[PDB]
Design a protein around this nucleic acid. Structure first.
Ligand code: MG
Lengths: 115, 98, 129, 87, 92, 107, 92
DNA sequence: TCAGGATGTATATATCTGACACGTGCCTGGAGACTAGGGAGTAATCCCCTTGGCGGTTAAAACGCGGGGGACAGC
DNA sequence: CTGTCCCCCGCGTTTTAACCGCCAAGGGGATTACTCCCTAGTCTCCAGGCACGTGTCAGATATATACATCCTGA
């Protein structure tokens, strides 16, 4: 649940760096971090204390969420290419295709007189 | 039977202990809530610097401790070792706080 | 205890209450069935986690979920901000009237049979005076 | 309780019996009657009302919404209780 | 020559208890009273200007100084009176 | 060139002009706002008037038609807020309030 | 920039107990101490000059203010020290 | 508990004065008119610090409970 | 100085809220730029206020007289 790592500023993250000799680390998460982008960087930096130059380097380095195919596909393609050996991700659809349905639905309701 | 100290032995230990040390004696979060509530009666939606609260507590404890010092003295004057509301009220009345 | 009890095939209870922040992650449950969201989510990922607690490898039954949003309110506002936040998921993926009972029953139906069950219930709701 | 917490007591009750006792110990009080605890709370409440009122008055004057340490200091200074260490 | 508030105090007295007079000792007391209040308010207004890194004492500073000087109702009414005086003054 | 005093403009009985000068001569600040001495003079009047009212009442109670220091003492010491305001003030020839403790009085 | 007397207090400490250091908390206390004293002396000197209808604060007023502020021997030494310092200053 | 008496307090009557109220002439300090310039108001940015809630532990607060020491009433 | 009783203290057990860590929004505390208008400064005029005389009556003081108040024999 490395998602929790989020912001490297945290005490958790801090004390982990003070675990010193840990010759090989691995992060498990069900999802990539917050949409800002630095969080993704922070985790990537945490995992591999090499991937850096600025905490928010991704805002420029992979300036897709911050032209069409050009700024999107090509940049996110290279995002993938550099993260290709670091992120492993497969979808349940890709893996099984056995989930009974899309299992989705939302509803809306009115307030009571008091509410 | 288990060991029990004569009443007052522990009291003196506490007195020595608390006079020797310097930390705050009132739980900080309870203190903050008290402050914030009081503040609402003069103006709502106020914020406090955390240091502002600390300033209030340093002063508040200093005040109450000083009060207890004088209160204690009054009890002694009346040949008692137990402080009573009458002693607090007197002390403030003599100081001119009421 | 509770987790084992959830796993128990003969569970006396059929439902349970969970903390988004805590229970949203803490559950392996292939016998999970339906999920109802009340808390709403400033960070959509937590709902994705909570939501998908109900269907992991080994999940046998069709999962249904609900999100209870009030009409014309702050919940809609927060919800839409959450919907905006989901865009980054798309970036990663590409890199690599509202109270009509019949309608509600339709959205909750697995079979018209449940609609029928509710019909009886609403008739009971009517029967109560 | 379980069904309803019902744990709302009072902010003045946040000053506990042992908290007061501790203050008294620093003061040098050997023995404390049971009515002291309530009396002490009353006194403190008043003290804070006066200081806070002055502090927020300075805050209002300056057209700000956050009461600062200096505002508290000024309040205390106004009342003849100069506090060192907070600038 | 030496100025005082004797005649102003006197006029005020006449506006409250027309028939009542006032001894010279009582008057000297009232004179020193006025000076005392004047100084307390002015003193607070002064440091208010310093606290806000300003340099002009206006009715805002004085108003605040009053709120930081007079107790309870005295403050409430003094502020009310000050407000009215300035209001009329600038209105006409 | 019709002249009209600021005190009369404000409708006050105190010398707004004098007050203004005093604020400047006392160096309370670099600048003194035009509405400052007006506001202040009003306050000075307010407080003055309230004391005189009470003093006059004291005089009436003692069947006097002239305010003396004793009356001023009685006025200030009786009113709660004035007592607080002038809590550190000794009024010459004022004396003290009539007050004998019940513990000293006979049963 | 937020000027203070930290460096001066520090230097003084090293001239009295050269080896002794000082915590930052204690330093802020000393800083506020200096400000307090400064204000008290200056404040008295201010109204002192005012009492004599004078517009200039000189070393005479500061001296008197010290005599009217500090207690006992403390005052005597402060006065002695100030006198000496000025003497040297005007010489140089 | 009650009446007598000695003292003290209070109360009407002159009467007497000196301290307060009031009139007058002067003069300087306050008002008017006018000009400059800089302090304060006001808008726009930004970002750091505050706030509200939750998770999780654990020292501390609460609570009961016996019993001895002090508070206190009496003399 | 003495008796007595009650109530505060010492202590074991149990509950609970403070402390610390985390997470998220966001909004007031700062900055700067610009402008404008409010007040310092100055000169001129004039009456509001001040010192000084001057009357007169409000309260102080005698002066005789009627009632409250406290102490005691009853
Ligand atoms: Mg996991």
């Amino acid at each position: 649940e490395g998602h929790r790592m989020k912001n490297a500023q945290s005490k958790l993250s801090f004390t982990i760096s003070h675990y010193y000799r840990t010759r090989n680390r691995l992060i498990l998460t069900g999802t990539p971090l917050q949409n800002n982008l630095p969080e993704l960087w922070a985790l990537l930096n945490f995992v591999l204390p090499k991937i850096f130059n600025s905490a928010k380097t991704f805002e420029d380095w992979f300036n897709t969420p911050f032209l069409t195919e050009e700024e999107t596909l090509l940049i996110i393609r290279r995002l993938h290419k550099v993260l290709r050996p670091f992120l492993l991700r497969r979808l349940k659809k890709e893996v099984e295709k056995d989930l009974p349905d899309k299992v989705e639905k939302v509803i809306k309701c009115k307030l009571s007189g008091l509410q | 039977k288990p060991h029990r100290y004569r009443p007052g032995t522990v009291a003196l230990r506490e007195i020595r202990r608390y006079q020797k040390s310097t930390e705050l004696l009132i739980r900080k979060l309870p203190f903050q809530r008290l402050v914030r509530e009081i503040a609402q009666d003069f103006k709502t939606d106020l914020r406090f610097q955390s240091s502002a609260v600390m300033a209030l507590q340093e002063a508040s404890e200093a005040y109450l401790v000083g009060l207890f010092e004088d209160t204690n003295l009054c009890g002694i004057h009346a040949k008692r070792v137990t402080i009573m509301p009458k002693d607090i009220q007197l002390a403030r009345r003599i100081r001119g706080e009421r | 205890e509770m987790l084992n009890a959830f796993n128990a095939p003969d569970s006396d209870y059929f439902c349970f209450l969970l903390s988004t922040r805590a229970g949203g992650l803490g559950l392996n449950l292939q016998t999970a069935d339906t999920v109802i969201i009340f808390d709403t989510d400033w960070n959509p990922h937590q709902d994705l986690q909570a939501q998908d607690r109900a269907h992991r490898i080994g999940q046998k039954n069709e999962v249904r979920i609900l999100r209870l949003i009030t009409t014309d309110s702050v919940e809609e506002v927060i919800l839409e901000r959450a919907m905006q936040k989901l865009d980054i998921d798309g970036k990663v993926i590409q890199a690599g009237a509202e109270l009509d009972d019949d309608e509600l029953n339709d959205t909750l139906a697995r079979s018209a049979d449940e609609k029928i069950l509710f019909d009886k219930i609403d008739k009971e709701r009517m029967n109560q005076e | 309780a379980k069904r309803h917490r019902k744990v709302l007591r009072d902010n003045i009750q946040g000053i506990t019996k042992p908290a007061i006792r501790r203050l008294a110990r620093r003061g040098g009080v050997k023995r404390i009657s049971g009515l002291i605890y309530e009396e002490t709370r009353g006194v403190l409440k008043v003290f804070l009302e006066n200081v806070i009122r002055d502090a927020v008055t300075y805050t209002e004057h300056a057209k700000r919404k956050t009461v600062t340490a200096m505002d508290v200091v000024y309040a205390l200074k106004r009342q003849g209780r100069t506090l060192y260490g907070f600038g | 020559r030496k100025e005082s508030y004797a005649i102003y105090v006197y006029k005020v007295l006449k506006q409250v208890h027309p028939d009542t007079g006032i001894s010279s000792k009582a008057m000297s007391i009232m004179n020193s009273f006025v000076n005392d209040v004047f100084e307390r308010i002015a003193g607070e207004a002064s440091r208010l200007a310093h606290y806000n890194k300003r340099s002009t004492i206006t009715s805002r500073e004085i108003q605040t100084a009053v709120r930081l000087l007079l107790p309870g109702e005295l403050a409430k009414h003094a502020v009310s009176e000050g407000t009215k005086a300035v209001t009329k003054y600038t209105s006409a | 060139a019709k002249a009209k005093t600021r005190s009369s403009r404000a409708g006050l009985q105190f010398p707004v002009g004098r007050v203004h000068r005093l604020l400047r001569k006392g160096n309370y600040a670099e600048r003194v706002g035009a509405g400052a001495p007006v506001y202040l003079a009003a306050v000075l009047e307010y407080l003055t008037a309230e004391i005189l009212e009470l003093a006059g009442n004291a005089a009436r109670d003692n069947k006097k038609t002239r305010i003396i220091p004793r009356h001023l003492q009685l006025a200030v010491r009786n009113d709660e807020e004035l007592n607080k305001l002038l809590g550190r003030v000794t009024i010459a020839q004022g004396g003290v309030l009539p007050n004998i403790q019940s513990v000293l009085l006979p049963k």
